[PDB]
Design an enzyme around this catalytic site. Structure first.
Site, PDB file in Angstrom:
ATOM      1  N   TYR A 122      43.697  42.139  28.711  1.00  0.00           N
ATOM      2  CA  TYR A 122      42.864  40.836  29.163  1.00  0.00           C
ATOM      3  C   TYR A 122      41.430  40.711  28.563  1.00  0.00           C
ATOM      4  O   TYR A 122      41.032  39.749  28.215  1.00  0.00           O
ATOM      5  CB  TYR A 122      42.825  40.799  30.641  1.00  0.00           C
ATOM      6  CG  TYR A 122      44.092  40.215  31.435  1.00  0.00           C
ATOM      7  CD1 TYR A 122      44.448  38.965  30.953  1.00  0.00           C
ATOM      8  CD2 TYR A 122      44.736  40.978  32.322  1.00  0.00           C
ATOM      9  CE1 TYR A 122      45.653  38.434  31.454  1.00  0.00           C
ATOM     10  CE2 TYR A 122      45.943  40.368  32.920  1.00  0.00           C
ATOM     11  CZ  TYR A 122      46.402  39.144  32.177  1.00  0.00           C
ATOM     12  OH  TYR A 122      47.577  38.579  32.744  1.00  0.00           O
TER      13      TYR A 122
ATOM     14  N   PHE B 153      43.402  39.118  44.247  1.00  0.00           N
ATOM     15  CA  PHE B 153      44.405  37.854  44.312  1.00  0.00           C
ATOM     16  C   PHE B 153      45.047  37.878  42.845  1.00  0.00           C
ATOM     17  O   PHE B 153      45.955  37.165  42.695  1.00  0.00           O
ATOM     18  CB  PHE B 153      43.565  36.572  44.246  1.00  0.00           C
ATOM     19  CG  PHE B 153      42.464  36.542  43.149  1.00  0.00           C
ATOM     20  CD1 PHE B 153      42.630  36.120  42.012  1.00  0.00           C
ATOM     21  CD2 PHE B 153      41.088  36.981  43.356  1.00  0.00           C
ATOM     22  CE1 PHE B 153      41.944  36.041  41.090  1.00  0.00           C
ATOM     23  CE2 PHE B 153      40.208  36.838  42.397  1.00  0.00           C
ATOM     24  CZ  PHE B 153      40.725  36.506  41.141  1.00  0.00           C
TER      25      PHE B 153
END
Ligand SMILES: Nc1nc(SCC(=O)NCCN2CCOCC2)nc2sc3c(c12)CCCC3
Ligand SMILES: Nc1nc(SCC(=O)NCCN2CCOCC2)nc2sc3c(c12)CCCC3
Ligand SMILES: Nc1nc(SCC(=O)NCCN2CCOCC2)nc2sc3c(c12)CCCC3
Ligand SMILES: Nc1nc(SCC(=O)NCCN2CCOCC2)nc2sc3c(c12)CCCC3
Ligand code: NA
Ligand code: NA
Ligand code: NA
Ligand code: NA
Ligand code: NA
Ligand code: NA
Ligand code: NA
Ligand code: NA
Ligand code: NA
Ligand code: NA
Ligand code: NA
Ligand code: NA
Lengths: 396, 396, 396, 396
Positions: D120, D396
């Site tokens: 990422y 999440f």
């Protein structure tokens, strides 16, 4: 302690003994499916004067042998002696009765999967196929330049729910089993069973996924406890393209550290990778076991290597007859003789040679197979060897 | 960063890099023995403008190949790049220089043992032999009725100190290596080394014992940490009698739970027992790796199966030449041609076929070996196969 | 049970108690080296009416604190009560006597390494530095584009025998310890000791290697039992270039799976990699412990952050005095007052703040540090914080 | 391979890919709840000419940043590429499309939880919070004299069923998330989800209990397999009293050996005990990751330390713009300039600084953050630092 064919009233007693004898027992409602494969007079029970203390049965199977030849096979299964009735010759009595029935029904071979490797040699069964666990650390796995399906454009492999592609799996398995030694016809009821175990069990196994190719499929699930391991339960590929494509997809499971599969010693997967060693052999065990019921009928039915030239010998099987064996053009003629034996073996040894998994040289080195001529040993090795490598179909 | 043959002043620097690069390094005084097997101009070092940041060498070896034929072999060893000089093409440069020298010296093959399974394929080396750890739970081990040397009277196997029977071990190993593919001549200095590791090390390995037969020996020691495990370091048997007799003696180690050995896939031990499964395969790995330096010289030198009939084809090795290959009467003739290739493979693949450990069918299934004719595939399988099963001699 | 300074006749008795009290004890001949760092009247023993049942001593150390300021430090060590004389107040009696002597000698601070984390708070010692084990799986480790020394040309790092580059290691460590909070002067005798543990022990630790840069060094050895793990015993880098270069070399140990090191929470290594997560924190523990002997002398001696503006408060240390503390221009003035305290803490808490490892906010959240003004809390946090991150020198 | 917003007909295909891509997938009925947090045009799917081979979406989140300031945050989630479509630039294509949409919708920041720490950074995400597992051996745990709520009279903490005190937990969490950097608004549907996982699953997790204080709560359950371990899933305390009181209650679980919790590096628990070392750090990992979508909007929105004085610099973000940054009075003004840059960093590095978890000095030591002025480095460290320590809200 009398030996009888079970009545419908005997099965609850057999299911009780099954639950106590086999830890993997799938319960009565699931055992109805397998029961359809047991012929009339396929089962024996022993009662004590009363409850079931003993049972054994055979199922009607179709085994593929070298030369794409399909033999009727008595599949021995559900064998169990009560813990209360050990060392009482109940197994010997039950196996003898079934073998009588299997022989008189016209099965040339019987087969079983062994719970232990030390029980079944004395009853004439030889280990005929080898199971081989490969574990791939897929983090380091890169495919070789030479590997098929490593070019641009789309993938042919799809990720799918097993239950919605039953017809395609059947079609592929049916093509597969007909062309591979060790292949077994998988009837409808066993496809019902296989797909009921695809879904997730509460506090049991996880959901099974499928990778689907026109000429191949792989069923896999993540391990219960180890969440970085994918267990490939079943991979059937008809073409090298399908095999390779399916492994590209499996190596693409980027959330797993390890893909494991029970395959055969000649699985080409190690050679698909730039590093052969990444596909470690973690586990190795006897698969299918064969008892040759009728030596001439079995030896005559299978194909032999075209590469070895015509040759003749006399084979003695211990308490199984002596035979003039003539092999040429990949056919065998097996006829009674009283001529001096050139090659001797117990019947179990013939089972181990029959599908090509074991070399006659190796069994000779162990003196399981006596001959005074090593030229004849090389010729048996060459003739009995299988062109298509031998594989294990499904456990029964 | 210049590439040179080491002077005597360079070895201390090479021993420093060896100590930091290989955890098993046996120190300088023991490395004098192996150094005797390195020919003049057998070693390359890379210096940085100064200390040794790079090294590789070959040893003069004699490898037995199928047909009891002994080839001169360059054994690649002591390869190391400083941790300070990775991803700098020093290995590529060193391997290229040695291969030049190996080729120009008239070695038809080079061989190595790989530290990793992913490095050596690109330099033309193929895995040629398979290592196979068997672990016997010897508490359950009973020998089969058919097994040799299970009759009354004396045993032929003796328990002995290795150091007092060096001559007998040499004699047996010399007979063994001459008749087994993968066999290597073990020179005097390596027998000195082997017997110095037989004695117990303070806080290291335990005393090694020997089982001695007229036609066989086994060296074993109890494991450092696991005192119920005997590690068989080396078992050499020339006759099936010797092999069996030695295992009766090993299974007789009544203070051990497990006997372990690194052997070959065709070891007959599993078939000596009433229970094949008691000899579990715990571990499996690539053994010796082969680079075919001269394709025609190597293909012509080895024997082929007499069983397959005469046949001709054109073999292309990628950047290694194209050849009219004619195999018959277990001899091969390999001659230059520009005729269309029927069979293509990278040079490493030929290494993997050369000793008979890998089947051409298997490598073809992985597309490492391209042909459009499966009849030719079966014929290559049959011809390249080894009658005597292929074994790994000693690690170098 | 009388408390005395040891005579030369008492040491054999102290070495006996040391051998039974500390498992890592390096024996008497090695303890001669450390003994040179114990001043006259640095040691106390307790005799029973007779043998040594109790001992404690301090060594003369030089500790670097924030602002590159070097304090004389009493290093507490070799503390031991006989198993036969527990729960008898011998530790309390010995610690009291040493603290008296440490105080009266003019040490502003004492320091120790704790065998347990629950003993030393009550004697005024606070954990002042944090140890941090990083384990790199170096197989996946790739350096970031932004990382220094990733361009072409030569490496500046050399692989060397520690014993032949003692002068260079000393020079680098001397530069390092002078500029880093937690740094300790390492005297000649401890360099003798450190390099004697570099060599391989028979059935002990393996040979230690060194990576040497102009501005850095790393000492590492392969683990005794785990042969895929390199333990970095000590890495000292003076410049970010040296730090990075040394880790490129360590990640280049291609025969290891894991490099482990005990470092500090602010080690930049995780940020050198494209994947921060590859440098896992496997272990975390209190390092050096501080007892502030003289509050005004210690608070005045260290530098403070220039970033926070001038501010004044009254600090009460429990049974350690009350002080007007004025901090500005990164200097502190600490003077007696009877003015109302704004901030209260036990003396151990001041030790934990003193090198900047722990934030006053955190200790306040635990009510180890009472104030009714959170503006003052932020200002203490900011002023006590260290610009150069705090590190642990060597265990004593 | 076209990139589209999913229709209602696409979700079954997305749920199939989710089940195969994430082992923790909670099934479709539970995914309806999270779906409410996905805005119209928050999701992208890739179809192959057909089924879903690719998906990614963002959820509307509210992130608290330093200065008790709540930012709209695009929470990236449910990212998955079919194992059949790896190394095909589908992630790059999907992330680019979402970032376009996130940017054009007026989100100043996006955030995600990473499945791997190496993916990422290249898409502009920096690790912004640190997870920290503490394990307390509670058998040895005694609270310090200084610790709050250790006096006579009643306890304020109650043991309760989570499901019967939802309102009190909401109230406490709402107070908590508004005042803590890393805090996220937890909507109704996620409280429904959280309390459905409080109850015992057949052959899954055990019943969850709650410790309830006026200003705090702890949810814990005994581990599935280890019955001497309590896992604290979630502890939210608004006051130090609540925090301490809750840990007195947890240390009072006299049937457990170990209490474990995932908390933040500045958790004061170690300082509540007489022995800091009893609260071992067993595990440490990156928590929330930040992509700064709009540099000026984000830098201007958060509060800065009042302690550092006014200062100005030019910040260049690589391919993210150059800015005159003026920080004073804990506000920042961030304006376009073409003036020479004093400080350079990739955009991911700014994410890592933004919540105060990482020091600019540390990233500079790794050369992730270039400046030629160390005074400016200290000032950035001081200004970006968070007074309230940064915490991770919910995954999440
Ligand atoms: N043949 C069968 N196989 C299965 S599961 C396949 C399997 O992997 N079995 C290995 C272990 N066996 C477990 C059970 O049989 C012995 C050892 N399940 C049933 S119910 C059932 C049979 C049957 C035979 C027909 C009668 C009722
Ligand atoms: N060829 C040699 N072999 C041995 S021990 C046999 C063994 O099992 N080696 C496996 C691991 N190797 C360890 C060392 O070489 C690489 C990998 N020891 C020495 S000293 C030495 C050699 C040499 C080559 C000649 C020069 C000096
Ligand atoms: N201060 C010393 N340190 C060492 S080894 C460094 C080390 O890591 N010690 C940790 C464990 N300690 C072990 C020994 O002291 C307590 C706990 N070795 C000796 S011999 C010796 C000392 C001494 C003090 C001076 C008198 C004789
Ligand atoms: N964002 C969501 N989160 C959860 S469980 C919280 C958690 O801890 N996730 C970590 C692992 N993830 C697992 C799933 O998403 C990726 C990685 N469950 C669902 S269903 C669902 C979402 C969703 C997004 C909205 C669409 C449907
Ligand atoms: Na069949
Ligand atoms: Na396979
Ligand atoms: Na048989
Ligand atoms: Na030889
Ligand atoms: Na053997
Ligand atoms: Na080759
Ligand atoms: Na110092
Ligand atoms: Na370091
Ligand atoms: Na103190
Ligand atoms: Na918020
Ligand atoms: Na907490
Ligand atoms: Na960012």
């Amino acid at each position: 302690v009398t030996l009888c064919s079970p009545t419908e009233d005997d099965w609850p007693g057999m299911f009780l003994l099954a639950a106590a004898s086999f830890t993997d027992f799938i319960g009565p409602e699931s055992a109805t499916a397998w029961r359809t494969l047991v012929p009339t007079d396929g089962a024996v029970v022993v009662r004590d004067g009363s409850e079931v203390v003993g049972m054994a049965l055979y199922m009607d199977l179709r085994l593929t042998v070298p030369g794409e030849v399909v033999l009727p096979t008595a599949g021995l299964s559900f064998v169990a002696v009560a813990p209360t009735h050990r060392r009482r010759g109940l197994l010997r009595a039950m196996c003898a009765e079934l073998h009588r029935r299997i022989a008189d029904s016209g099965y040339p071979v019987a087969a079983l999967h062994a719970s232990e490797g030390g029980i079944y040699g004395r009853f004439g069964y030889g280990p005929a196929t080898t199971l081989h666990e490969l574990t791939v650390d897929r983090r380091f796995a890169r495919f070789h330049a030479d590997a098929p399906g490593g070019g641009l454009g789309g993938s042919s492999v799809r990720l799918v729910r097993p239950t919605e592609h039953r017809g395609e799996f059947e079609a592929i398995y049916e093509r597969w089993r007909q062309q591979v030694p060790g292949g077994l016809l998988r009837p409808q009821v066993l496809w019902d069973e296989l797909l009921a175990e695809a879904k997730a069990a509460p506090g049991g196994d996880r959901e099974s996924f499928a990778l689907l190719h026109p000429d191949g499929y792989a069923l896999y699930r993540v391990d219960r406890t180890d969440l970085k391991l994918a267990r490939v339960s079943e991979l059937r590929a008809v073409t090298a393209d399908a095999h390779c494509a399916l492994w590209r997809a499996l190596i693409g499971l980027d959330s797993m550290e390890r893909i494991s599969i029970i395959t055969h010693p000649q699985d080409p997967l190690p050679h698909l990778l730039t590093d052969t060693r990444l596909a470690r052999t973690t586990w190795r065990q006897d698969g299918l076991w064969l008892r040759i019921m009728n030596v001439p009928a079995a030896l005559e039915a299978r194909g032999y290597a075209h590469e070895v030239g015509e040759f003749s010998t006399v084979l003695e099987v211990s308490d199984g007859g002596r035979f003039a064996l003539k092999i040429g053009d990949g056919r065998a003629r097996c006829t009674p003789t009283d001529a001096a034996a050139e090659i001797e073996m117990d019947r179990d040894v013939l089972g181990s040679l029959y599908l090509g998994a074991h070399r006659a040289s190796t069994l000779a080195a162990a003196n399981r197979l006596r001959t005074k001529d090593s030229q004849l040993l090389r010729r048996l090795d060459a003739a009995f060897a299988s062109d298509v490598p031998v594989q294990t179909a499904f456990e029964f």
